[PDB]
Motif scaffolding. Structure first.
Motif, PDB file in Angstrom:
ATOM      1  N   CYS A 114      20.140  48.909  55.072  1.00 39.87           N
ATOM      2  CA  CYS A 114      18.927  49.297  55.176  1.00 39.87           C
ATOM      3  C   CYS A 114      18.262  48.263  53.931  1.00 39.87           C
ATOM      4  CB  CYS A 114      18.775  51.006  54.965  1.00 39.87           C
ATOM      5  SG  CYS A 114      19.122  51.650  56.101  1.00 39.87           S
ATOM      6  N   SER A 115      18.547  48.006  52.503  1.00 40.61           N
ATOM      7  CA  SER A 115      18.249  47.698  51.135  1.00 40.61           C
ATOM      8  C   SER A 115      17.732  46.344  51.775  1.00 40.61           C
ATOM      9  CB  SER A 115      19.615  47.566  50.110  1.00 40.61           C
ATOM     10  OG  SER A 115      19.823  48.925  49.543  1.00 40.61           O
ATOM     11  N   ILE A 116      18.235  45.416  52.815  1.00 43.36           N
ATOM     12  CA  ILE A 116      17.282  43.951  52.694  1.00 43.36           C
ATOM     13  C   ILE A 116      17.911  43.443  53.751  1.00 43.36           C
ATOM     14  CG2 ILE A 116      20.851  43.734  53.580  1.00 43.36           C
ATOM     15  CD1 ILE A 116      20.558  40.893  51.860  1.00 43.36           C
ATOM     16  N   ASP A 117      18.469  44.344  55.472  1.00 46.86           N
ATOM     17  CA  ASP A 117      17.514  44.139  56.643  1.00 46.86           C
ATOM     18  C   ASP A 117      16.886  45.389  57.346  1.00 46.86           C
ATOM     19  OD1 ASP A 117      18.242  42.736  59.433  1.00 46.86           O
ATOM     20  OD2 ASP A 117      19.073  43.711  59.892  1.00 46.86           O
ATOM     21  N   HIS A 118      15.887  45.626  57.068  1.00 44.13           N
ATOM     22  CA  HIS A 118      14.564  46.841  57.337  1.00 44.13           C
ATOM     23  C   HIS A 118      13.834  46.502  58.108  1.00 44.13           C
ATOM     24  CE1 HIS A 118      14.206  45.126  53.441  1.00 44.13           C
ATOM     25  NE2 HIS A 118      12.791  45.534  53.498  1.00 44.13           N
ATOM     26  N   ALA A 119      13.945  46.670  59.026  1.00 41.00           N
ATOM     27  CA  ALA A 119      11.705  47.165  59.193  1.00 41.00           C
ATOM     28  C   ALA A 119      11.111  47.286  58.124  1.00 41.00           C
ATOM     29  CB  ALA A 119      11.716  47.228  60.136  1.00 41.00           C
ATOM     30  N   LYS A 120       9.594  47.492  58.049  1.00 52.67           N
ATOM     31  CA  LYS A 120       9.012  47.666  57.112  1.00 52.67           C
ATOM     32  C   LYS A 120       7.388  47.683  57.310  1.00 52.67           C
ATOM     33  CE  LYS A 120       9.448  45.608  53.345  1.00 52.67           C
ATOM     34  NZ  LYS A 120       9.473  44.500  51.852  1.00 52.67           N
ATOM     35  N   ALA A 121       6.905  48.875  57.541  1.00 56.73           N
ATOM     36  CA  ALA A 121       5.582  49.305  58.049  1.00 56.73           C
ATOM     37  C   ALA A 121       4.530  49.322  57.142  1.00 56.73           C
ATOM     38  CB  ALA A 121       6.044  50.958  58.529  1.00 56.73           C
ATOM     39  N   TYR A 122       3.431  49.087  57.333  1.00 55.58           N
ATOM     40  CA  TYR A 122       1.960  49.428  56.613  1.00 55.58           C
ATOM     41  C   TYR A 122       0.904  49.521  57.119  1.00 55.58           C
ATOM     42  CZ  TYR A 122       4.798  45.215  53.850  1.00 55.58           C
ATOM     43  OH  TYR A 122       5.236  44.415  53.353  1.00 55.58           O
ATOM     44  N   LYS A 123       0.528  49.798  56.756  1.00 57.04           N
ATOM     45  CA  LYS A 123      -1.223  50.604  57.429  1.00 57.04           C
ATOM     46  C   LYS A 123      -1.971  49.172  56.478  1.00 57.04           C
ATOM     47  CE  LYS A 123      -1.550  55.244  56.560  1.00 57.04           C
ATOM     48  NZ  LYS A 123       0.641  55.367  56.830  1.00 57.04           N
ATOM     49  N   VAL A 124      -2.528  48.139  56.859  1.00 58.07           N
ATOM     50  CA  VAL A 124      -2.951  47.261  56.747  1.00 58.07           C
ATOM     51  C   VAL A 124      -4.776  47.128  56.864  1.00 58.07           C
ATOM     52  CG1 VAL A 124      -3.345  44.684  56.933  1.00 58.07           C
ATOM     53  CG2 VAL A 124      -1.304  46.239  57.405  1.00 58.07           C
ATOM     54  N   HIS A 125      -5.251  46.774  55.616  1.00 54.73           N
ATOM     55  CA  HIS A 125      -6.654  46.394  55.500  1.00 54.73           C
ATOM     56  C   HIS A 125      -7.116  45.529  55.510  1.00 54.73           C
ATOM     57  CE1 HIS A 125      -7.348  50.683  55.255  1.00 54.73           C
ATOM     58  NE2 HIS A 125      -6.361  50.710  54.196  1.00 54.73           N
ATOM     59  N   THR A 126      -8.264  44.590  54.606  1.00 54.34           N
ATOM     60  CA  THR A 126      -8.738  43.056  55.182  1.00 54.34           C
ATOM     61  C   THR A 126      -8.602  42.912  54.026  1.00 54.34           C
ATOM     62  OG1 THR A 126     -10.719  41.924  55.631  1.00 54.34           O
ATOM     63  CG2 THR A 126     -11.319  43.913  54.055  1.00 54.34           C
ATOM     64  N   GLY A 127      -8.748  42.900  52.867  1.00 56.84           N
ATOM     65  CA  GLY A 127      -8.509  41.800  51.905  1.00 56.84           C
ATOM     66  C   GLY A 127      -9.179  40.745  51.868  1.00 56.84           C
ATOM     67  N   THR A 128      -8.393  39.732  50.874  1.00 53.53           N
ATOM     68  CA  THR A 128      -9.047  38.398  50.848  1.00 53.53           C
ATOM     69  C   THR A 128      -8.439  37.052  50.839  1.00 53.53           C
ATOM     70  OG1 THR A 128     -10.771  39.816  48.787  1.00 53.53           O
ATOM     71  CG2 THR A 128     -10.617  37.340  48.469  1.00 53.53           C
ATOM     72  N   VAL A 129      -9.294  36.371  51.172  1.00 56.41           N
ATOM     73  CA  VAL A 129      -8.233  35.089  52.181  1.00 56.41           C
ATOM     74  C   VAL A 129      -8.302  33.775  51.275  1.00 56.41           C
ATOM     75  CG1 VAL A 129      -8.625  35.961  54.180  1.00 56.41           C
ATOM     76  CG2 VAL A 129     -10.446  34.010  53.882  1.00 56.41           C
ATOM     77  N   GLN A 130      -7.473  33.172  50.540  1.00 52.92           N
ATOM     78  CA  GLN A 130      -6.967  32.420  49.939  1.00 52.92           C
ATOM     79  C   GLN A 130      -6.921  30.417  50.097  1.00 52.92           C
ATOM     80  OE1 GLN A 130      -4.244  33.591  47.610  1.00 52.92           O
ATOM     81  NE2 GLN A 130      -5.431  34.999  46.763  1.00 52.92           N
ATOM     82  N   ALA A 131      -6.872  29.961  49.487  1.00 46.56           N
ATOM     83  CA  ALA A 131      -6.793  27.949  50.109  1.00 46.56           C
ATOM     84  C   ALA A 131      -6.241  27.718  48.692  1.00 46.56           C
ATOM     85  CB  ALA A 131      -8.016  27.765  50.645  1.00 46.56           C
ATOM     86  N   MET A 132      -5.355  26.336  48.993  1.00 48.53           N
ATOM     87  CA  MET A 132      -5.285  25.140  48.004  1.00 48.53           C
ATOM     88  C   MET A 132      -6.257  24.429  47.974  1.00 48.53           C
ATOM     89  SD  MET A 132      -1.117  25.455  47.793  1.00 48.53           S
ATOM     90  CE  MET A 132      -0.204  27.063  47.279  1.00 48.53           C
ATOM     91  N   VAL A 133      -7.560  23.612  48.457  1.00 47.57           N
ATOM     92  CA  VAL A 133      -8.288  23.733  48.731  1.00 47.57           C
ATOM     93  C   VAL A 133      -8.285  22.329  47.667  1.00 47.57           C
ATOM     94  CG1 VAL A 133     -10.639  22.228  48.752  1.00 47.57           C
ATOM     95  CG2 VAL A 133     -10.314  25.078  49.158  1.00 47.57           C
ATOM     96  N   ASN A 134      -7.702  20.861  48.101  1.00 45.38           N
ATOM     97  CA  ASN A 134      -7.817  19.702  47.705  1.00 45.38           C
ATOM     98  C   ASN A 134      -8.964  19.533  47.603  1.00 45.38           C
ATOM     99  OD1 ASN A 134      -7.679  17.401  46.411  1.00 45.38           O
ATOM    100  ND2 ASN A 134      -6.052  16.147  48.313  1.00 45.38           N
ATOM    101  N   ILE A 135      -9.779  18.233  47.020  1.00 45.44           N
ATOM    102  CA  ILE A 135     -10.918  17.515  47.201  1.00 45.44           C
ATOM    103  C   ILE A 135     -10.613  16.349  45.939  1.00 45.44           C
ATOM    104  CG2 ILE A 135     -12.979  17.121  46.693  1.00 45.44           C
ATOM    105  CD1 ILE A 135     -13.831  20.295  47.259  1.00 45.44           C
ATOM    106  N   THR A 136     -10.038  14.943  47.175  1.00 47.53           N
ATOM    107  CA  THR A 136      -9.693  13.763  46.420  1.00 47.53           C
ATOM    108  C   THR A 136     -11.344  13.677  46.528  1.00 47.53           C
ATOM    109  OG1 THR A 136      -9.649  12.480  48.413  1.00 47.53           O
ATOM    110  CG2 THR A 136      -7.351  13.012  47.363  1.00 47.53           C
TER     111      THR A 136
END
Lengths: 400, 325, 98, 49
Positions: A114-136
């Protein structure tokens, strides 16, 4: 010159827009949204895992009853039993024959897995998206910065200040309710903490791994041991974590829509190519070149020579460059019909230099802006033959 | 004990050892944490926080604290000293004005800094009372056993000391404190570095054209803005701060109770505070319709209470609530 | 609130000291000439215009930043709770968080 | 913006990196004396209180 630009959300390809600042020389962009990792707002609702019926060792009173009590262990199943004659290493040992009493008790407990091999539920809302944008960028030629999407966040990493989004394509590929397992993420309507029917998913429901309290609907039912022998019949559903590993559903990194990948990491959904992003940058004015220093290129001519009606940059076109000075000249097709591999072309005194591109219309009538000089590179293109490799640079399909 | 340039040192800009940097009138409890460039506390060696070591000359003077004075608009109250740093309970003041008395001289130091003391609470006192509710103020400690932060304290740069540059009966004559490192040359061409015992000067003659320097980095300093850099290196000397801002519950404010008066779905409130009190309410409908007003002048006010209820906040006195059916 | 925890300026006595843009937050640094810095012995740098002074200052979190600090948030909806008492029926008690 | 709320903007307390638009502008010290004119907006955390 704060170059606003609507911009398609798609990960692995630059977006070489062009800065048309009135007064000084224009500068190309190269905006490659290398990642679209999402990280919605979430809540750890309960870990589940397979139980372990870690039986406490039963009582055996030899002549008369031993009433059991409902100890507070999770799913503390306990049932007194009489009518035994418990064979234990010397034949039986309790000298009575019906007053021989046996009190079996068993509670549910988290496995060590259970400590290590375990499913895991969540109530998931929307949050905020990201990116490692390269600009050369421009002549800067480099910045690989982590950014946000919310349309007032800058990220002054490098020299340019850049504001992204908010994107219009709010499809969180995560559903509201999600189960998570190691790396395979399941947008599953987990029943809830505190409720899960035995055998079904979440028969064990612990808030976290440390949480000594839990909910164990396992339908654990003790039965009397047989024929006067010491043991503990525990009749129980094998876990809804045992199933859910071999009668499960498929993972969201294998069933999602609109092109996402997943990690058991900040719970991102990488590289979700969908919709557009209204992106706007404030360039450093120092990076600009004044207009009177780049060659003026007009009185030129452009023509395709072998246009490939395709994704890879198969389209080519010589350009009869007619310069004034000699040097570099950033290029771009303000029309989205043509996507060009070269941001910049070097120029001698009015030479000619082919570039590469890709289109989607049989008759590509796209303007080309060679550092403040427009030109139609009209022509005709040829279909290819060899279409089984990763994703395109064209991404401009329309009515043709 | 570092020495820097005090800005209005009695007359004008002197170089006081108690040169005041980093005034912090940012807490609530009438307190300011200050840094002198002087390091009072124990002596040079080992004893008694309540002694007093500033710099006189190139040298310390580790003696008694007898007549310290921090002050502002009024004379402050010392709280505690540790290291370069003193905590003192002050009133508000446009400036900050510090000074001890060595005994032969006043020898003070003064500085500009905007100071105020709002207590935490909807009462805008000017000063902490003896009574009232306790609630979570921000405030500095009495103590020294403190590590919550540490400021960089690397070496001193050199310092001037033209007491060194005497005359060798025709030539300008430098000496040394204790074998310290004196960095020397003159406008003329002579010895160009200076890492020496007492040298002479072959070439130049005038004291006023020579490098009277003291690389004396046997003891580090605070990294004051009024320090010249020790050009060689960022030496070690990470050093704590005693007076961390902590979550003390100040003995704190309280405004006199209101006079509740009934009317039809309306609270008349004849009201009469001690000090400017921020009153405010929340009509608990989904229409909030709140109100805010600092009240220092006694005022009969009114509140259209609704059917479901209103709440009422006479300063940091607890919030009331009211059924007005 | 910030604290302009000034690093101690350089003073080159005869000639310039070019500054560099160190990576400290808001690392403001500007070379200055034309000084004659009175430091405990009158001035000490023997030149008069080649006396150079390089001031540098960066922004740093206060010590109060740890403890007395505003705190922004992007706030979504989440999930509401309650310590519902029911003094039920003849049970007469349960005070549970739900 | 400097002076406005969030002139200092640190991700957390531990975060050594931050954003400090304080409009910190050093000026030359006066009349040949050692000090550091730092001309700066008092914080948008000072106001906001």
């Amino acid at each position: 010159y704060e170059h606003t630009a609507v911009m398609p959300n798609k990960v692995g390809i630059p977006y070489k827009a062009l800065v048309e600042r009135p007064g000084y020389a224009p500068v190309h962009l190269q905006i490659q949204l290398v990642n679209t990792r999402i990280i919605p707002s979430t809540n750890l609702e309960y870990i589940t895992c397979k139980y372990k019926t870690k039986v406490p060792s039963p009582v055996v009173k030899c002549c008369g009853a031993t009433q059991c009590t409902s100890k507070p262990h999770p799913d503390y199943q306990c049932q007194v039993f009489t009518g035994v004659y418990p064979f234990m290493w010397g034949g039986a040992y309790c000298f009575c024959d019906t007053e021989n009493t046996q009190m079996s008790e068993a509670y549910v407990e988290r496995s060590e897995e259970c400590s290590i091999d375990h499913a895991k539920a969540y109530k998931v809302h929307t949050g905020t998206v990201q990116a490692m944008v390269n600009i050369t960028y421009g002549s800067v030629s480099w910045r690989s910065a982590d950014v946000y999407v919310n349309g007032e966040t800058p990220a002054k990493i490098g020299d340019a200040k850049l504001i992204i989004g908010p994107l219009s394509s709010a499809w969180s590929p995560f559903d509201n309710k999600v189960v998570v397992y190691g790396h395979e993420v399941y947008n599953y309507d987990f029943p809830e903490y505190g409720t899960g029917k035995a055998g079904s998913f979440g028969d064990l429901q612990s808030r976290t791994s440390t949480s000594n309290d839990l909910y164990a609907n396992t339908n654990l039912k003790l039965q009397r041991p047989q024929a006067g022998i010491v043991h503990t019949p525990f009749t129980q559903a094998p876990s809804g974590f045992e199933r859910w590993k071999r009668d499960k559903g498929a993972p969201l990194n294998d069933v999602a829509p609109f092109g996402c990948s997943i990690a058991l990491e900040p719970l991102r959904a990488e590289n979700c190519a969908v919709g557009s992003i209204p992106i706007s940058i404030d360039i450093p004015d120092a990076a600009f070149t004044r207009i009177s220093e780049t060659p003026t290129v007009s009185d030129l001519e452009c023509k395709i020579t072998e246009c490939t009606y395709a994704s890879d940059f198969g389209g080519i076109a010589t350009v009869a460059y007619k310069s004034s000075k000699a040097g570099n000249c950033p290029i771009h097709s303000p029309s989205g019909v043509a996507v060009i591999k070269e941001n910049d072309v070097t120029l001698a005194e009015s030479g000619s230099f082919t570039f590469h591109f890709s289109t989607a219309n049989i008759h590509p009538a796209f303007k080309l802006q060679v550092c403040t000089s427009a030109v139609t590179c009209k022509g005709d293109c040829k279909p290819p033959k060899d279409h089984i490799v990763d994703y395109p640079a064209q991404h401009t399909e329309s009515f043709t | 004990p570092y020495i820097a340039d005090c800005p209005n040192c009695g007359h004008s800009r002197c170089d006081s050892p108690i040169a005041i940097e980093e005034v912090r009138g940012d807490a609530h409890a009438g307190v300011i944490r200050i840094q002198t460039s002087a390091m009072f506390g124990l002596k040079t060696d080992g004893v008694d926080l309540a002694y007093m070591s500033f710099m006189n000359g190139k040298t310390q003077k580790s003696i008694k604290i007898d007549n310290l004075h921090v002050r502002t608009s009024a004379p402050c109250s010392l709280v505690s000293h540790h290291g370069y740093y003193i905590l003192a309970q002050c009133p508000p003041g446009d400036t900050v004005t510090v000074g001890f008395h060595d005994g032969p001289n006043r020898h003070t130091c003064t500085v500009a800094h905007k100071v105020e003391f709002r207590p935490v609470g909807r009462e805008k006192y000017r000063h902490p009372p003896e009574h009232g509710v306790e609630l979570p103020c921000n405030r500095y400690t009495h103590k020294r056993a403190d590590q919550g932060h540490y400021v960089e304290m690397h070496q001193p740069g050199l310092v001037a000391d033209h007491s060194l540059l005497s005359i060798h009966s025709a030539k300008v004559k430098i000496t040394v404190p204790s074998g310290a490192q004196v960095k020397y040359y003159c406008k003329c061409p002579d010895v160009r570095e200076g890492i020496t015992s007492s040298d002479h000067t072959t070439t130049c003659t005038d004291v006023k054209q020579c490098r009277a320097y003291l690389i004396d980095n046997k003891k580090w300093v605070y990294n004051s803005g009024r320090l010249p850099r020790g050009e060689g290196d960022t030496f070690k000397g990470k050093l704590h701060v005693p007076f961390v801002p902590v979550k003390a519950k100040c003995i704190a404010t309280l405004a006199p109770e209101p006079l509740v008066e009934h009317k039809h779905r309306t609270l008349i409130l004849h009201l009469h505070p001690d000090h400017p009190t921020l009153l405010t309410t929340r009509s608990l409908g989904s229409d909030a319709n709140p109100t805010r007003q600092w009240i220092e002048r006694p005022t009969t006010v009114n509140f259209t209470v609704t059917g479901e209820g209103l709440e009422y906040t006479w300063g940091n006195h607890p919030p009331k609530r009211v059924w007005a059916q």
